[PDB]
Amino acid sequence: SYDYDLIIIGGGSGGLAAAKEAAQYGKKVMVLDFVTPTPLGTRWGLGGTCVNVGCIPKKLMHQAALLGQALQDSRNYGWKVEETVKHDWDRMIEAVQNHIGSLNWGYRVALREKKVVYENAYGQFIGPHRIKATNNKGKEKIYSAERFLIATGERPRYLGIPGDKEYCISSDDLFSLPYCPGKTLVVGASYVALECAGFLAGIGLDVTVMVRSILLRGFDQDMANKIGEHMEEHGIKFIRQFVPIKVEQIEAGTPGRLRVVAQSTNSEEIIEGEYNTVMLAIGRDACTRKIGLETVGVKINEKTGKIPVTDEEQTNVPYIYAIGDILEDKVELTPVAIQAGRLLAQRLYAGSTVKCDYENVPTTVFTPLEYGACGLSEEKAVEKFGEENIEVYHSYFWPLEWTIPSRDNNKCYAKIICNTKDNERVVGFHVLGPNAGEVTQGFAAALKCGLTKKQLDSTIGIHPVCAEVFTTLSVTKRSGASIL
Amino acid sequence: SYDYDLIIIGGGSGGLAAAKEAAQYGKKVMVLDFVTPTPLGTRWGLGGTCVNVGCIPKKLMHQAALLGQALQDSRNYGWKVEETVKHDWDRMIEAVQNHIGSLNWGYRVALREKKVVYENAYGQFIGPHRIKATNNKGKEKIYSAERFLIATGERPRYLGIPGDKEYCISSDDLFSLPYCPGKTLVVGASYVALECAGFLAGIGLDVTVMVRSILLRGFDQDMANKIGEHMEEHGIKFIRQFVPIKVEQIEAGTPGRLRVVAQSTNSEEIIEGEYNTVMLAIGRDACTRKIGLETVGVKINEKTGKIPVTDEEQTNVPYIYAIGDILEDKVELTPVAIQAGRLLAQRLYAGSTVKCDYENVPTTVFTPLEYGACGLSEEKAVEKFGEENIEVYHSYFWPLEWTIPSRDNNKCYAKIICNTKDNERVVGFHVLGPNAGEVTQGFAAALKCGLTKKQLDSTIGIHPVCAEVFTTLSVTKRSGASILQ
Numbered sequence: 007s008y009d010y011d012l013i014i015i016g017g018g019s020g021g022l023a024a025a026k027e028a029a030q031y032g033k034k035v036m037v038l039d040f041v042t043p044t045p046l047g048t049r050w051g052l053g054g055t056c057v058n059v060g061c062i063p064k065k066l067m068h069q070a071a072l073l074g075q076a077l078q079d080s081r082n083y084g085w086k087v088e089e090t091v092k093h094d095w096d097r098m099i100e101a102v103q104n105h106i107g108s109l110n111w112g113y114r115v116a117l118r119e120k121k122v123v124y125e126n127a128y129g130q131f132i133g134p135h136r137i138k139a140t141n142n143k144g145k146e147k148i149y150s151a152e153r154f155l156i157a158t159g160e161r162p163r164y165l166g167i168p169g170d171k172e173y174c175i176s177s178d179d180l181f182s183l184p185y186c187p188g189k190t191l192v193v194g195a196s197y198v199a200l201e202c203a204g205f206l207a208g209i210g211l212d213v214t215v216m217v218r219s220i221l222l223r224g225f226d227q228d229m230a231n232k233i234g235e236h237m238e239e240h241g242i243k244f245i246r247q248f249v250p251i252k253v254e255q256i257e258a259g260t261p262g263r264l265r266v267v268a269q270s271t272n273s274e275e276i277i278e279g280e281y282n283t284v285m286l287a288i289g290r291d292a293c294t295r296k297i298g299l300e301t302v303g304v305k306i307n308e309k310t311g312k313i314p315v316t317d318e319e320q321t322n323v324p325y326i327y328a329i330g331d332i333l334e335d336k337v338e339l340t341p342v343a344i345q346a347g348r349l350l351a352q353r354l355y356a357g358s359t360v361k362c363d364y365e366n367v368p369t370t371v372f373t374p375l376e377y378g379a380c381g382l383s384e385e386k387a388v389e390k391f392g393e394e395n396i397e398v399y400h401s402y403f404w405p406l407e408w409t410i411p412s413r414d415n416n417k418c419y420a421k422i423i424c425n426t427k428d429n430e431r432v433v434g435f436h437v438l439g440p441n442a443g444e445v446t447q448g449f450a451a452a453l454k455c456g457l458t459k460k461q462l463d464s465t466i467g468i469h470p471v472c473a474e475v476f477t478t479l480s481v482t483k484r485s486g487a488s489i490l
Numbered sequence: 491s492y493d494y495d496l497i498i499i500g501g502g503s504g505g506l507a508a509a510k511e512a513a514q515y516g517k518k519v520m521v522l523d524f525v526t527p528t529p530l531g532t533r534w535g536l537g538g539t540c541v542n543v544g545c546i547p548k549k550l551m552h553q554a555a556l557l558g559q560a561l562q563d564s565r566n567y568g569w570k571v572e573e574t575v576k577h578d579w580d581r582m583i584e585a586v587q588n589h590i591g592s593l594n595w596g597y598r599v600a601l602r603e604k605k606v607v608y609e610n611a612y613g614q615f616i617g618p619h620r621i622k623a624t625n626n627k628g629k630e631k632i633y634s635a636e637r638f639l640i641a642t643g644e645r646p647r648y649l650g651i652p653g654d655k656e657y658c659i660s661s662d663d664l665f666s667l668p669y670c671p672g673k674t675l676v677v678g679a680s681y682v683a684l685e686c687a688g689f690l691a692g693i694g695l696d697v698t699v700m701v702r703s704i705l706l707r708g709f710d711q712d713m714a715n716k717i718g719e720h721m722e723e724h725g726i727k728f729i730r731q732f733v734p735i736k737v738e739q740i741e742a743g744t745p746g747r748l749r750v751v752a753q754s755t756n757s758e759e760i761i762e763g764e765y766n767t768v769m770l771a772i773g774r775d776a777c778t779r780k781i782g783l784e785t786v787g788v789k790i791n792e793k794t795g796k797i798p799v800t801d802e803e804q805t806n807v808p809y810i811y812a813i814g815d816i817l818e819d820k821v822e823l824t825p826v827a828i829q830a831g832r833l834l835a836q837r838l839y840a841g842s843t844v845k846c847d848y849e850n851v852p853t854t855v856f857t858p859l860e861y862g863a864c865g866l867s868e869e870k871a872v873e874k875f876g877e878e879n880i881e882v883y884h885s886y887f888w889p890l891e892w893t894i895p896s897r898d899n900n901k902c903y904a905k906i907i908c909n910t911k912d913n914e915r916v917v918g919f920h921v922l923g924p925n926a927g928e929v930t931q932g933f934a935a936a937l938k939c940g941l942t943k944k945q946l947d948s949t950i951g952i953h954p955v956c957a958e959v960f961t962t963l964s965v966t967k968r969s970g971a972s973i974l975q
């Protein structure tokens with residue numbers, strides 16, 4: 007009957023994971039992926055947001071910046087390095103792009119290998135079980151399939167103000183900028199804004215972050231506020247409670263000069279500044295509006311763009327499933343998308359009954375001083391169980407490696423959130439320090455095991471590594487005792 | 491009435507932990523700590539092995555060598571740095587000793603603050619409840635207490651071959667060495683041996699390792715072999731199955747020149763080589779022989795020197811307890827010493843009833859490429875549960891940060907051992923890669939919770955970080971499938 011057993015719209019994290027898992031059980035699978043250019047014309051290869059314009063490029067630039075701090079730290083350890091080393095933007099972009107290009111290609115090869123058909127075409131539903139796919143030259147073809155999986159990701163959102171689409175860049179553009187950004191204004195104050203500002207400042211640039219309200223809305227504000235302070239102390243300038251209303255080009259160039267006009271969120275005062283680059287990092291929009299979901303009856307939430315699904319990634323229309331950043335009320339991260347994609351396939355074609363668990367998924371914000379978390383923030387814990395039933399254990403720490411260079415004492419921070427009414431179940435894990443991701447992974451598998459403060463107390467730390475701090479936390483926030 | 495509620499012999503990791511924990515509950519406490527010099531005369535302050543000649547200086551040196559790699563790596567990320575940077579041994583040592591100084595002082599101040607009496611004197615039992623203390627000038631005093639705690643640690647072991655104590659250095663000396671070691675020979679093949687060899691190589695010295703039998707005896711041999719290959723593929727030279735028999739001084743200096751003569755372990759072959767420094771890292775001896783244990787009746791293991799003890803750190807003599815390295819069949823690690831000390835005090839003075847858990851204690855070998863482990867090695871597991879009931883999941887992995895420098899793909903390696911007869915519980919965890927301590931700590935807490943492979947699979951990884959590799963292991967050793975990248 008149908009052309010394919012399964013057609014996947016979108017070839018990023020979720021989509022490709024699902025493709026390969028499906029092909030393994032002998033299914034006839036087709037993957038559609040197309041990358042609509044950026045206002046400025048930026049486009050990229052197979053792989054999704056993470057491979058081309060997210061995790062991978064972000065992490066590598068994070069490292070270019072960390073290596074800069076490494077150069078400095080090397081002097082007090084004996085390395086005869088100059089006091090000021092220069093960084094080359096072009097050289098860096100070329101390296102990051104070579105690596106990205108290698109993954110574009112590897113993905114392509116992995117599909118050919120697993121017998122998955124790849125079509126570099128934009129897909130959209132035209133009627134029950136059928137879809138139109140349009141390539142770059144506009145040529146079209148229609149395909150049918152027993153089931154469909156929607157995995158289209160999202161894209162950088164805009165402000166809708168004069169000059170935005172014309173002179174600004176977003177995360178889609180940054181990772182391949184053909185010239186050094188120069189003085190930079192980054193607008194927004196969550197994951198993307200802070201990580202990007204963080205690495206831009208780390209390789210030597212003049213960076214300013216314009217915040218509308220608070221930093222990292224949704225995360226523990228105690229932790230967010232310390233991430234903010236660390237960035238301030240370390241270079242990045244902030245403009246608080248202001249939003250840009252107009253961006254104008256004082257002059258074109260590589261880079262040129264730009265004029266940004268901003269207004270208070272609680273006053274009528276207005277300000278203005280001059281920057282070489284203005285990056286917008288104010289959110290991302292689900293790519294669910296233009297794929298013909300009406301022609302096949304899939305309901306979304308027309309307010310947010312997200313597709314509500316069952317706890318098996320099934321939408322209202324039964325033969326159509328969705329995974330990834332587009333889901334409503336889930337977790338927007340690469341490994342979550344991969345897990346959903348692999349399990350989905352396993353439940354469809356391998357008789358599995360295991361579902362993806364979106365609870366206590368750990369994350370790490372790659373700011374100059376990394377932030378790792380899993381579970382509840384303190385705010386959300388007090389709320390869910392009651393202040394009277396929450397005990398918070400915390401402590402500053404100083405990475406051994408920092409003592410010789412003699413910097414940042416008592417800037418790193420660890421805290422766990424315990425539920426008194428439940429044998430002190432560790433409901434929240436937060437860490438601000440080097441290698442936060444490496445430190446958090448294992449604790450996340452311990453929260454899945456029901457870790458209790460008692461069990462944690464009885465785990466012996468490894469000396470001398472940062473993670474050990476969690477092994478001996480004794481001061482509570484309630485007790486009022488200092489931890490400085 | 492005795493002079494003190496408790497006297498601690500040893501002001502290192504276990505001793506100082508228990509001291510502070512016991513002074514917490516208002517008991518009168520005294521801590522005796524003395525550092526008898528090395529054959530070459532090296533001595534140091536309060537703190538113990540870790541502080542002055544172990545963990546701390548070791549890791550800091552491991553770091554000087556990681557930074558060397560960071561400088562190399564920095565070029566492809568765009569930093570304009572020289573293809574080759576020179577390293578100053580003096581600046582490095584002077585920096586490490588300035589930090590050790592701080593800790594010595596800090597530790598003294600902590601003792602003062604908790605109202606703990608500190609005698610920089612050598613201690614030994616003389617009769618029931620009584621002890622003699624000798625300071626540096628020979629002046630002695632006698633003290634009594636209701637209870638005693640032995641926490642004396644150990645000291646580098648020597649070979650007993652011509653020239654060893656005369657011309658060789660041990661970890662006690664390396665960390666304060668007043669001159670760059672130059673071409674170096676490291677005898678031994680475990681923790682100290684590989685870590686030290688690893689970092690002298692990392693700062694640019696010619697380094698060689700002489701190995702009697704196998705590497706890291708006791709550890710997983712698959713992991714051990716790989717740590718080996720990594721070191722070999724990254725400079726470090728190995729001489730296998732030989733043992734030195736004579737060290738002689740071709741010429742004194744700073745450094746001088748030495749000739750080492752060694753002999754095969756399975757033939758009559760004999761070889762010789764010239765080195766500037768020869769470091770012995772062949773073990774450590776419990777400091778339990780000269781503390782007057784007979785005058786008070788504490789029974790030890792005459793062979794090993796390790797004090798046997800109850801699951802409460804209590805010796806044969808009721809009011810005499812022991813913690814730390816000297817214990818027999820426990821875990822010779824700083825954090826374990828600390829746990830025992832603190833908990834011992836809690837049980838004595840605070841009604842606690844919690845004993846120190848010596849099972850599945852984690853550890854990390856800080857070699858050039860780090861190795862973290864917790865639980866059972868593969869061999870150890872197969873033994874205990876039967877080969878037919880062990881499923882091993884494993885994989886190579888390539889840190890994202892290494893792709894741009896374009897180096898060492900397929901070198902890092904991860905592996906877990908599951909017991910199939912027990913819901914595939916994770917009985918063993920091993921990882922060879924960067925920041926292996928940071929990656930291992932949390933998983934050690936998961937093993938404490940009875941982590942099962944199924945729960946591990948249900949844990950979502952953090953991307954892109956190395957530990958995420960444990961999140962998605964699907965290839966079993968039994969299956970035969972390849973695990974390359």
Ligand SMILES: Cc1cc2nc3c(=O)[nH]c(=O)nc-3n(C[C@H](O)[C@H](O)[C@H](O)COP(=O)(O)OP(=O)(O)OC[C@H]3O[C@@H](n4cnc5c(N)ncnc54)[C@H](O)[C@@H]3O)c2cc1C
Nearest residue numbers: 016018019020039040054055060129158159330331339340
């Ligand atoms: C700057 C940045 C940094 C990030 N860092 C991290 C991190 O460190 N760790 C982490 O876990 N997550 C990170 N994320 C989030 C991560 O990128 C997403 O969670 C992940 O990419 C989601 O995968 P996906 O499949 O759901 O969507 P995507 O990966 O974006 O895949 C969607 C693909 O579908 C294509 N597509 C869309 N519509 C169509 C259509 N109609 N036809 C054909 N193809 C179509 C798209 O062009 C895209 O290539 C980051 C995101 C950004 C933006």
Ligand SMILES: Cc1cc2nc3c(=O)[nH]c(=O)nc-3n(C[C@H](O)[C@H](O)[C@H](O)COP(=O)(O)OP(=O)(O)OC[C@H]3O[C@@H](n4cnc5c(N)ncnc54)[C@H](O)[C@@H]3O)c2cc1C
Nearest residue numbers: 500502503504523524538539545613643814815822823824
């Ligand atoms: C090179 C090296 C690196 C190491 N690295 C690590 C690591 O990374 N992580 C880790 O967990 N462990 C490490 N260890 C092991 C760790 O240092 C020990 O496990 C720990 O120090 C044991 O503490 P302790 O109190 O039991 O004995 P110690 O800490 O050694 O304290 C014993 C003290 O007692 C003193 N003393 C002895 N006899 C007397 C006496 N009669 N009177 C007065 N004082 C006396 C000694 O001089 C010494 O200062 C390392 C060891 C070495 C040698």
Ligand SMILES: NC(=O)c1ccc[n+]([C@@H]2O[C@H](COP(=O)([O-])OP(=O)(O)OC[C@H]3O[C@@H](n4cnc5c(N)ncnc54)[C@H](OP(=O)(O)O)[C@@H]3O)[C@@H](O)[C@H]2O)c1
Nearest residue numbers: 194195196197198218219220223287288289338370371372
């Ligand atoms: N390391 C990682 O794992 C990682 C890193 C980066 C991105 N990501 C993924 O990418 C997603 C998108 O991140 P994002 O940071 O772009 O957005 P986000 O998480 O939705 O945050 C939007 C940010 O922009 C601000 N903002 C919104 N509208 C604004 C306006 N008109 N003017 C000024 N500021 C405005 C918000 O402030 P208010 O508080 O005022 O709303 C907030 O700081 C993440 O949520 C995550 O799923 C993951």
Ligand SMILES: NC(=O)c1ccc[n+]([C@@H]2O[C@H](COP(=O)([O-])OP(=O)(O)OC[C@H]3O[C@@H](n4cnc5c(N)ncnc54)[C@H](OP(=O)(O)O)[C@@H]3O)[C@@H](O)[C@H]2O)c1
Nearest residue numbers: 678679680681682702703707733771772773822854855856
């Ligand atoms: N990272 C950490 O936590 C860490 C780091 C360093 C030290 N430590 C602590 O310090 C303890 C002692 O360390 P260690 O490495 O010195 O000793 P060890 O663990 O006892 O191992 C001794 C090593 O020396 C070899 N050897 C013994 N006698 C020899 C001889 N006559 N000639 C040549 N080689 C000989 C052994 O080989 P065989 O196999 O033939 O015996 C073995 O490789 C550890 O067990 C640990 O408690 C911990």
